[model samples]
Target: DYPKALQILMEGGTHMVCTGRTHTDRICRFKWLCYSNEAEEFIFFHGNTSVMLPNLGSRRFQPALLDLSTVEDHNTQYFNFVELPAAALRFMPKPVFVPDVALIANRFNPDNLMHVFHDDLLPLFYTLRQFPGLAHEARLFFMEGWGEGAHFDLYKLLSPKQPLLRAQLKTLGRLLCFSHAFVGLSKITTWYQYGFVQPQGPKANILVSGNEIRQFARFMTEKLNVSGEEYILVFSRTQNRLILNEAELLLALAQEFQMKTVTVSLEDHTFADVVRLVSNASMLVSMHGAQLVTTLFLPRGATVVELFPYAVNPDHYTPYKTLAMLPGMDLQYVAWRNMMPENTVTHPERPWDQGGITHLDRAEQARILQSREVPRHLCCRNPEWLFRIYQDTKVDIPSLIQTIRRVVVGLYPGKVREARCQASVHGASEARLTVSWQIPWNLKYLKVREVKYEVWLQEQGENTYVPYILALQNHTFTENIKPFTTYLVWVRCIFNKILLGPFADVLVCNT
Candidate 1:
């Protein structure tokens, strides 16, 4: 039996507005949204009073939202529903109406810190920001069928309400109704790669900046009552990717930097404790692993030292490097690889996920063992790539210190922070283009040996542009400057010739 309110909703029908059609690209909005726990399906009921927004008859099911696995943007990813009539509610159990707006998404791998941060938390935070009030009042529904793994509290920070698990929906009622709902996860903000589809590298057009990343970190620290402190964070892994001489390495790093060193492990500390420690860290040192994703929490101007095991090329795996290098992240990234095979310990008898090569044919295993570097390859099941990446390494203290010194010593604080330009014409026969900009904000605070501006002047609607390097803040150009023509000017500052800054906003100058 249904209540009068539920009866009215079913009689009124359902309304929907969805943004996409495929699993990789689908996000749906629904009014009177219904979920069936027994069937594990979402139901859209239609009636005279119902309204279905942006109807896509069969396209909804061809491939649904969410690729259940880590493999991204594949057709196999699907989330669809079996449609039901509004009248069917009379036969089903009474519906429970959820009050708050809901954002329903899957946590790709909540246990792994990398996926939890990259694929789920970051994207979820930004996606909520995309819609008004979603961040404050919207409840989250995790349909991925995993119990709260390691970082459920981290996910909780996104909303005030406790997130509802898929299995818990059944306990609520036979039919659950969300007054409003958003389905599917947003992949727009992810900066790292899992090698699911293509060779892992930085994601294109990364939408997240360090400012936003730090903002979220601040929120977590505030909630956890963590105060900022100056220290170095060493992300320790106890099982795989182990540092053979961790104590010696930590002692050397502390002595070299003259800072207090603290060790944290995902298995040993609470996620909040880790975030609290990392939030004010001056440096983060770790073996190249998922835990390094916490670099997002480091204070600006912090240094990141990523150590790689032998046979694993630092160039081939760069999820952490890519994050540290994001614009406005202001992180100094340094990678040190074990060049000597003797320092690396390989486990040929362990499971494949732990980088064991025992299951492969003898010849194949022999080839893997002899290989000097793991080549670029797709993710998840590559035995050779996994074997090399999971090796434990004995740190070469002097060599590691040297690598860190080359990248972090005398590192500048900021990029070309500001730039602008202006243009004018002197006579019909001669035209002048004048560009001007100020020094990077941080340059004013520190002594810079050389500061130069690189400007590009392009005629409107033309492809090629003239480039110039000027030592002065302002430059006058009459060589290619034409009268009565429009020009586009771009300016960027370079520090000591090699430190390239991001280009400032484009200026359209009309002469």
Candidate 2:
């Protein structure tokens, strides 16, 4: 009776085309993709007329398109499939075709705020944009074997259809096929490093800007029916890495800025409420942790004040700092660390993941205790690093206030606008290179005490270049300019020698 009940998926033709060669490089496009719930396998049922794109033999599963776990690209991180002839469908359950095009990806970790934003949401948003037509109606399939986590609602905003979890596929059918599908992950848009393989820092060639980030924020706010207003947001953590004298800090901040200061916690407030508050906040103050990632939602010209516990060097752990400092982010950044040893409360008694160091050797524990600063080291399991980062701090109010005042005293200027660079070459034997640019577009409207342009001229294919500082927009160089050579030129504006603006697109000149 079951065999008689089985039906084959007819009518649709199977076609496939993929870009990328290795696991990290692979992204597949399928006219029809089949999923088998019982076997927990993705099936590419070959037919007489079926077209297999790429036709990767043994290399299909090499590194895998995306790692399902938080672990970086490892051999175990692969995603692959099984193959069978279309005739084999008659032996299995009835084939059911999904109506909408599906984007199949694994959420690295949907529960943690850092993983949610950096791994899943940002990548998914941009990945959808990478392919044509995926941005509008494509349904997301979270194959990462977890139930809907805390940030499921946030992911929902990306697509009109309710996202399907891996577990939910059974109800639909065993041999469910997609009319169109794309399988793989996009790691290009992420800006933060989690230290899975190396010490965490900002990624190179960060393609995302504050404009794209705020666009996603606007979508979330609109969906949640929330609006922005000027205020200050204090990101509070109740259980760990807490600010001890928060009340005093809040009062000082309110008095100092003359703005309504409010506190919100992930433990107390819904994620939407936090975004709503942070989206309009003129300033965001928080103890360094995943919660601070909400700075992405802050309005342009907002200030981010990050607090670090004792023994953890602010320079060493800079995920948030790097984000705040990204060009065109338009956010003021200030870091305050608790230098007083007595102000920090250690929890060596807690579990290892929660900053406990009791299980370690006595010598190691002693070394950690005496360490004034955590040295530069690889990420995740560094006992000293975890021990220091997890400790709660009794914030030194006066010290913190001083640090904040120094960084936020002036109205931080926005990024310089409309920098255009033009380069020209001169005579034959005595070659000369002339470069000219305009002042930052915003510079004309505001009064800046000191403005300078930093220019770098590099010969093509060379590692080193000549750096120059100029007060005016134009400069000419004849010292090292060589005849019949190609050069790459870069230019950027600086405000008072501290605030840095983004470099304009490079100019290639032939000399």
Candidate 3:
């Protein structure tokens, strides 16, 4: 009946509305009349108002109505379900709204889920029909840090012709109470959230820009007091483009410190080789641009020194923080000046200039390996921005190093030989430590379904096992042995369901 109704609505040029208060029948009948007879540009009333035009699905015009009405409380407000004229809904811009915001907002009010059902869900369903390839089952869930308000802001920026409130309502799709709820929703998933795309891992292994290498060399000289061999720098050619003059200055300082320097330019190296190099490096230094995305590579506790062009505003840092927190990784950054010599007013109100090398001096470079009072000019005044900067900057490098060192040592063969032997035995018997599982049936058929797999090793009681997650394809892995010892391996999946793995053992061997 549900599918039939949906098909009928799709074919007969009909409209439907599911209200928070009234029964589905009443709402549907009410909708038929509005479309068959009513003539209005917009309909407005109380109790979670919704407009169901012939083509546009439905929208919860107000939030309070959803809070007041429920399946049991059908009498909270008179449902004036209006089937908007086809002419009116046709004028609504379709591209401005997406599914992610709807899911996130629902995290606050589950009963309010029907709000999007009418406003965004119905409209999306109706509009998507214009494109034959759009699947009827496609549903999306969004995860946003700034919540409903932020999503609305982005929608307005990306699509101005659309009404701000209407655009926002569309983004606020079906709400889930918690991320864990995504598990249940997996059976009914399409999209969850939206974020900036950045290159990661192996892509970051190519040697950093020539100038960046020189900058690290400089930092080693002035800060750690250890010359040459203190650290290594890895950057891919693509990532190299982001390394400006400041990075080079830091490398120059490293050279002054008499530290050993090695560059792994992924120009021709294999993913395995790049992983090996990054895994062994003491600390990774990079810019705020795409290259910082490499933080996904280094082992947990490994320090990432990022450089942000001063002109770039704080909002851009949101994506990096999201990734870093999920992986238990640390990020460090050097805030550049507002306007560099090459100034372009990207955002007229917040013009950012082309940042360069002068910002990364010997004093600034020291912060990557040690802690000191960051200069006022370098430190941002906004707490939110400052926190993000700290996460990206090596504000606490010594502590980070100690943490990573401890894990490195634990991965040693002597301490946890049993775990190593177990993994080895499994690998020898039937590749026990690394078993391959087929993609779930339901997920395999989806047009947009993607999976993320993570592996971790646990020891008896040391709580020192290593862990890493393969975000896209299962091509690379990372271990968390402290000071270098091998322990247990842990695996998990990040699909619509966010399921963990069928455990596998990982044998740690010398690089």
For model 3, state the Cα shift of residue 176 in Å: 25
Candidate 2 ranges beyond 4 A from true positions = 1-14, 20-22, 65-77, 228-230, 359-363, 409-511
Give the clashing residue pairs of candidate 1, or none. Answer: 12-49, 12-50, 13-50, 15-51, 16-53, 64-79
Candidate 2, residue 369: CA error in Å? 3.2
Listed per model in order, the count of residue pairs whose N, CA or C atoms clash below 3 Å is 6, 1, 97
lDDT of each: 0.79, 0.78, 0.32
Model 3 regions lying over 4 Å from their true place = 1-59, 63-231, 234-282, 308-327, 330-511
> C-alpha displacement of 233 in model 1, angstroms?
2.6
Ranked candidates, highest lDDT first: 1, 2, 3
lDDT of 3 by residue, 138-159 (tens): 2333221124532232222221
Residue range 182-237, candidate 1, lDDT tens digits: 77666666776666678888877777777788777677677777753677889999
Quick one: best TM-score, which candidate? Answer: 1
> Tens-digit lDDT track for model 2 on 1-511?
2322223233223557877765564677887678888898888767655777777777665645434332364632467778877777657777777868888888767888877877777777777888888888899998878899988888898877899998999888777877688877666666777665677777767877767777766766777778636678899999999888899889988888888899999999888888878888899999999898888888789999999999888887777887777666799999999989999998887788889999766888999989999988875588888899989898888888888888872223444344443445555467778888767666767677888888888899986475797888788888878878988888888788887777878888886
Worst 10 residues of 1 by lDDT: 68-77
Candidate 3's TM-score reads 0.26
